[PDB]
Structure 1
């Protein structure tokens, strides 16, 4: 599960001046540089001048203000679950750490004691590290639900539902909260209702993965609709949150595992068990990233500025999608390209085949995944024409099948 990071390493070492990194989902400005969000520079300065801050261990489960703030962002300020004190939060090492802690919990305490046979269902296709994290937790039966229909380039809703109907009771279902990685296609709210209905009837466990809240619609509230719907339907569930993308805090490793239970006693028990799992993994979590997020989200002014920074990223992505589609169309590139602008989040699942990716990587020094996934936030007004013309070359020169064409 380390392909994107190897892609980045190959890109850095490449001497060719034309090179473009469209692999890893990391935001870039229109001049192709990292963007430290304005709200983050401001809160960092406030931390650097605040002499009451010490370096003593945080609690095992982490910084209380951060955990509350994060769960609130997922669930909404007026969530009934918050009001009924049936919500817990475990500060984690980014989204990955939240998924891993959640996985280790389920493998020890869920559906019996030390049950490694509980099926875990992930999307077809999904993030590379999903299978790897759940296998590391010791789960033996990892399965796929139909998701991507490559013919219609949207959701195979009937397949998805049918796979969930046939899942053994109590199976764990890893659901992308919004901004599906890699397809950029999410269920509509009406589709989510049908999914939830099947999960409720078959007692399936929702394990949400929320790594991109803000990037699907530009609006934090709207991107959490599905999480909030599952709360309202009476589910207990996990939701692994990352702030790597929406705060641009990749290298400070800031995540939160939100837990929604039936009652406060449920949460107290789950959390006391999570303490043991954290202790034998990283002991307790790092402070800097969590303090930046806690400060931002607990202050109405910084919060508003932050949501404006997220909107800025989401809007730049929209523009890059429109521009790429337009240039491919003006070049008369074969096939249709509306899927570039239909898809949402950070990525486009372009539909290019593995030989077309190989051409782009080795001949044109444009780095993307063998699947055809690109990071749309890697495109810029300066690289767009090179990327479009290169895709055109690949699509016209490299056939799907060498013979019979």
Structure 2
């Protein structure tokens, strides 16, 4: 019956974790997945989340469906985090926001909405990007291409090329953008680049579709949202998919949001309505448990403040890993430059290791990165840093 159904090759990032469990090298190390681990190498349970879940757990409550859009306070916490507490665009009722099944479900609901209402829009993703952006958009029958971003040769951005490419795009073509903490390269635009990008976006009338899964891991919560809040100020038709997977350490609960910034309240009404309708035909409504945790942490003034501190500890450990690895590597290999390690932002780093050298890391050391050189900096900690730095030094010499 199903003989023609192709095998699924598997998710790239996952068949790699698979491969990692199977290695029995003692000092092995997963730097391949995009998960935050702390100093001891485990996924934190945030204290704020812990309190929120104690509240959810007492009493165990009835479990009716959430609204299609999710919990009002979940959607409000997404909006405030992204646009700023009490931002004008929110006072004006100019953002249609739903809770979504992770940042992944936000991209999906946004792509389905775009596919339906702007069927001629094409989407362009950064070259390179998180592989899933492409499959999600294409899974909607949206035509997907790449804009020039990372410059392999310099490790910076092909800024002029990128802008030049934006200038060829049609009205309402979508650009799928990373406000900060680029994945996979860690190489981010400066504010000035953003202003330039957003000017082109306004001038060409493109749809900016910002995907933010690491807010608070770049510089701080507000700075990381610069490109969003500035698109807002510029009256752009900004779509924002946001994920709480990483900054709430709550991957498995599937908590994110999708927000669409509208010129007028009537358009918010129309967009919001259709967002709900698009939710309905997909999974009907989102998960209560994750919703509540977001609702309670975002809107409880003290848990909110605590959460911000916990996210910033995560942000700083990654920075100190970057700093530590850079100085370790620069002590141990002469005349090589690892500035990229500290110029990059967030969980990811494009190490500039060759696909071959990434192999050597697997085989000779049981250190896993993605073959494109992406490393998850959060996989490094003081117990493994010296073994990883050394394995890198070794591998940078055949």
Q: TM-score, normalised by structure 1?
A: 0.94
Any conservation in 2 of the 1:334–1:395 contact (CA below 8 Å)? no
Secondary structure of residue in 1 paired with 2:319? helix
> How far apart are the structure 2 equivalents of 1:5 and 1:281?
25
Once the two structures are overlaid, the 10-residue window that deviates more, 74-83 or 95-104, is 74-83
SS of the residue aligned with 1:257? Answer: strand
Question: In 2, are the aligned partners of 1:62 and 1:284 still within 8 Å (CA)?
Answer: yes
TM-score, normalisation: structure 2: 0.95
Do structure 1's residue 163 and structure 2's residue 165 form an aligned pair? yes
**Deviation at residue 13 of structure 1 after TM alignment:** 2.6
Which residue in 1 is equivalent to 2:100? 92
Rounded Cα–Cα distance in structure 2 between residues aligned with 1:193 and 1:277: 32
Deviation at 1:153, TM superposition (A): 1.2
How far the C-alpha of 1:333 sits from its partner, in A, is 5.2
What corresponds to 1:21 in structure 2? Answer: 30
Cα distance in 2 for residues equivalent to 1:205 and 1:29: 37
Structure 1 residue ranges without an equivalent (≥5): 398-405
Q: 1:79 aligns with which of 83, 87, 95?
A: 87
Determine whether 1:68 maps to 2:76. yes
Q: 1:305: which partner in 2?
A: 306
- Structure 2 equivalent of residue 269 of structure 1: 270
* RMSD of Structure 2 on Structure 1 (CA): 1.2
Instruction: Work out the CA distance in 1 between the residues paired with 2:331 and 2:239.
Output: 45
CA distance in 2 between partners of 1:333 and 1:49 (Å):
58
1:402 maps to none
- The answer on whether the counterparts of 2:30 and 2:379 sit within 8 Å (CA) in structure 1 is yes
Offset of residue 50 of structure 1: 3.4
Structure 2 distance, partners of 1:90, 1:171, is 23
Q: Matched residues in 2 for 1:55 and 1:320: separation? A: 42
Partner residue in 2 for 1:400: none
Tell me how far apart the structure 2 counterparts of residues 33 and 86 of structure 1 sit (CA, whole Å). 40
Aligned residue for 1:185?
187
- Specify which of 3, 13, 24 is matched with residue 4 of structure 1: 13
Cα pair 2:38 2:381 within 8 Å, conserved:
yes
CA contact (8 A) 1:333 1:396 kept: no
Answer whether contact 2:31 2:368 (CA < 8 A) is retained: yes
Give the conservation status (yes or no) of the 8 Å contact 1:94–1:242.
yes
Asked if 1:44 is matched to 2:47, the reply is no
Secondary structure of 1:174's partner? strand
Distance 1:254 1:245 in 2: 10
C-alpha contact (below 8 Å) 2:114/2:121 kept by paired residues: no
Contact 2:228 2:238 in 1 (8 A): no
Secondary structure of 1:88's counterpart equals strand
Matched, 1:291 2:292: yes
1:239 — aligned with what?
240
Structure 2: distance between partners of 1:206 and 1:119: 12
Match of 2:40 in 1: 31
Structure 1 residues 266-321: Cα deviation after superposition (integer angstroms, max 9, x where no partner): 11111221222212211110011111111111111111111100010011001110
How many matched pairs? 389
Report the equivalent of 1:210: 212
Q: Which residue does 2:5 correspond to in 1? A: none
